[PDB]
Amino acid sequence: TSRGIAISAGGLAVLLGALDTYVVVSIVTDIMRDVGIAVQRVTPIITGYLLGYIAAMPLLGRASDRFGRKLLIQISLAGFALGSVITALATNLDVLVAGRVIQGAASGALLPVTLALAADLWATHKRAAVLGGVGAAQELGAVLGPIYGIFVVWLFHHWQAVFWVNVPLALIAMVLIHISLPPRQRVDVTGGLLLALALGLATIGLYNAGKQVLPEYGPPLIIGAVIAAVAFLVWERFARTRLLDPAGVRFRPFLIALLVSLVTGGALMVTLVNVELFGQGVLGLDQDEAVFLLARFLIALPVGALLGGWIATRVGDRAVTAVGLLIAAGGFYLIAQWPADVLESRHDLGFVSLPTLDTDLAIAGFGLGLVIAPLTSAALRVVPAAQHGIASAAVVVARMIGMLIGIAALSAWGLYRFNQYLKEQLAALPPAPADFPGGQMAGQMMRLRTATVQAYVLQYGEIFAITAGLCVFGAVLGLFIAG
């Protein structure tokens, strides 16, 4: 039966859209040159994409319950091409952000709609292995994206090439999907747009780029997001159409699956930002080097996603999410023990030894990887067919929102306790060095630098100790997932 070929064609679209997510990380500077922006106020090129990616997802997911899954993959691929062209044509930041928004909204649909395609063509008991492949295609593309950006600029010497190359690839993807997928009234537009508005307010309000973690425009957008979320809940009690129709949905396991997904997203983003900051601040790496620290964490995620799906066809979603999150917790407990000379250290197994940095990140990312497929499986288990699209979107939007809530909350606490640690360090370091090169002001500046580094390393520990604890809390919730 052609379902294997169909989900392969969908997975290649998911891969294609995932490259476009973080591709900008390697071409920001080349964009800054051509658009005329000084050494960032460039952030709309990521926050605008993420707005489209998150906010448009539930409604485009729901649209696939009505208009099917082939048509929306085609539409989003055409929109992914269109947005790419708009960005390639940009003399102006205002045109880049518009095109990135369209690319983001387009690319946001591909993963949920394809997860729902897998849910249509497979029964639950073997489905988790297929969700692992689709999820692997997402996590792998997200990680190869920056390299794809480098490579096409090495080919074509202009960053615009990224978004020109998107157009043929999108047309190729539409061709594969046209021949591969099964052939073939309203959705809740008002609720979808209300939810999109709420998600957007939260996404702008939470994202940030030194004694304050939210933008000053953040708090009112966040409080507005709660209000827009209430308005969404209130509307759909009086709506005839509902975005997720509650008939037959078992909400206790469904909502626990969303909350665990939220937790996993926080643990992901917490690691993505703190490890790179630990690279620059404690290890003294270039920004380009510090991002590359994330490699073994980033590579381990798709490996976990693929294998966790296969194991979950056999041992169950509850178990793989629980064990996978305990593997993630173990990884984060190890990362909490990092010293400032971690690159020089190894784990000693007596008769083999392993690099500390690389394997702690591998363990942490593999644990989070194991959880992607069985969480999606267990959310889809407790919803009817023709709610697969909106249900797949909910799991991803929960993960994406959990990323932003995670950094905001843990950075707030980390910053609070950093300052308390800084009080302790300044009180305890030798009040001056004896014969410092450059004189006493250089010794006092170095004392202040020494205090901030020592306090930052103490902050770093608690953050990943809490992140480990929250993974254990998620692992426990994993046992109240569906079965």
Partner: nanobody, 111 residues
């Protein structure tokens, strides 16, 4: 706390011995590389996990070690020579790649 407080210097007859101590706080005692320096001149270095490293003039005559019960770094110095006369400092190496360090008021050793 987060200290670096030397003690244990004194007068020594050639061939004699001393144990220098460096009080610290367990919060950070085990999270950075440490070293002892002469007056600057590196004597001994220890990674956060205990990997030792020494200069040429040491000839295996000293040992750098950690005691986690009182969070003290030590130099046991044996068979001391007139050339070892110096101020000794215990230093925390705040960046290991650049070997940027911080240290306190030392302790003087005279042989």
């Amino acid at each position: 706390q987060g200290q670096l407080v030397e003690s244990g210097g004194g007068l020594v007859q050639p061939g004699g011995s001393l144990r220098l101590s460096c009080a610290d706080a367990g919060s950070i005692f085990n999270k950075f590389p440490m070293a002892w320096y002469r007056q600057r001149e590196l004597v001994a270095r220890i990674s956060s996990g205990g990997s030792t490293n020494y200069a040429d003039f040491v000839k295996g005559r000293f040992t750098i070690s950690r005691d986690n019960a009182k969070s003290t770094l030590y130099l046991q110095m044996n068979s001391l020579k007139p050339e070892d006369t110096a101020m000794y400092y215990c230093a925390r190496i705040i960046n290991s790649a650049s070997n940027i360090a911080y240290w306190g008021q030392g302790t003087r050793v005279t042989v």
